[model samples]
Target: KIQQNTFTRWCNEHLKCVSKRIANLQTDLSDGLRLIALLEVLSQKKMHRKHNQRPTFRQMQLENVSVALEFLDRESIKLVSIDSKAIVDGNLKLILGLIWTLILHYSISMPQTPKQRLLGWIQNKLPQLPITNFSRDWQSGRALGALVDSCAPGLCPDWDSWDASKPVTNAREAMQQADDWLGIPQVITPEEIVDPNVDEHSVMTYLSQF
Candidate 1:
């Protein structure tokens, strides 16, 4: 029930734009009109075939669902071992599985990695700095200091004085100042970041909080 409720909420969030919603994933999605609307909204594209707007009969409902399933297929979104009959019949298990598949493909699979996105934002902020990789680029801690100073100017005003040679000290000072002023936590240790083989994902994680 919890999963159903959560999935329904997620559906309604997207469906709200089109003035459509699904209270019961099984019964609500049985007809397939709402399902088509959902796919259209999520993909920002129309169904290849015209769906029955008012599908009154079971056959009509099944055909409508088939159109939606075919749309998914055309988009290369695999719907393994599921069919329109299962949806039209309101098979709760199959319906849940179908919704989960949609969530995975449409909602979760469309974005770049957290590390890449954070790196892009950091690079945009500190364009002057040579921030190619999260590991060696952040070893000096000058990047971190410059980032904090850029976001909150007076917080780390002495960025010019930060020495790249003293990576540990520079990391500690910048992290401390960020924690004090910006409330960003020092989740990763300065020693860890100063190490040559620092974990890129960990560094990205810490900087992402900025």
Candidate 2:
């Protein structure tokens, strides 16, 4: 849903823009500020894609997505034709907002460490101003149940009865199991996840998280 929408094309284009030295990193890149702008666009692209695969969009209160986009539109220095240093550095953090936005949108069922959960609980519950989404490594289209059960032995479906609550994670061939929610691909299938260099970066981590 995200990539299928407009402005999603901006991430790859901005990436090309940066790589082509249209906004050179050595001399001009604002370390993270500028990169944030580019990544925000990407995060949104991923969000919409997730939306298509999930059944919870109508249920989840996606206020962050609304206000955040509004924030970007009003606050963001329109850089559709810009390659300036200022625009890149200034709106950088907002890009991160988008990434966290997607994560928060998929919160609740996406399990995390207790520390992470506590932090998330505080950030979410003790809000001072208008709430912006933040939490988890998940996006739209993926199921939180599926996301959690897929770890280690992996989540599986119940073939014994009419109930779907069954979660079987086994390595044996006798156990035919599944987490139907994983049917959709939340991340890209680029060569990156299958990279030959494990030290360069985790292909699994990259695809698994951000």
Candidate 3:
């Protein structure tokens, strides 16, 4: 606690890599497939940068991840599935329900293994076991399915009641499930409208009104 060199030395060691990670999210928010591909590249680079080092997760600047995740969430909600925007409802609730929990896991540092502490950035991802089961519980039980305020672990509302708490494990499969709910076109119901008009403009106007 008394050494000046130690603090400066730590900064010199990690400041660059940490700065790069912050930049990675910025570049990802850009328009283009290139940014998405860069996520893979950055993941590898982050691994290399953090190979032997561990930073307390409390030290990470994770606003970018939160911002980007919110952006993805908005992108997928092209059509509102529910009557209320204030609360996520129906299938939309389920997908965003799980994804948001994942984001919280990513943003908050969890020492998944008891013996170690994660200091900065992230390590792989926090285990998905707990959150997965929460998703299942929502599906089988509630038509309301709202747990945005609670996490699955540690006093989370649905912890014990959830069907099974295990990671999905298959990335491709999990993503496909997410894709299914994204940008769902609205449920269109057909109905007949009568216009007591014989003119051409009247018929055209009638159809357009629908």
Clashes of each: 0, 10, 4
lDDT of 1 at 173: 88
Candidate 3 similarity to native, TM-score: 0.15
How do the residues 172-204 of candidate 1 rate in per-residue lDDT, one tens digit apiece?
Answer: 988999988898766566777777766554565
Q: lDDT score of model 2?
A: 0.30
lDDT of 2 by residue, 1-210 (tens): 222111222223445544522233222223333334444554433221222112233222133233234443444423232222322343443432343333333222243643355345434433432212222211221222232233323443221222222212111111112223333332322222222322211212122231
* RMSD of each candidate relative to the true structure: 11.1, 16.3, 24.2
Best by TM-score: 1
Off by over 4 Å in 2: 1-66, 69-93, 104-181, 196-210
Ranking by lDDT: 1, 2, 3
Ten consecutive residues with minimal summed lDDT in candidate 1? 107-116
Q: Which candidate is the best by lDDT?
A: 1
- The Cα local distance difference test for each model comes to 0.79, 0.30, 0.24
Candidates sorted on TM-score, descending:
1, 2, 3
TM-score of 2: 0.23
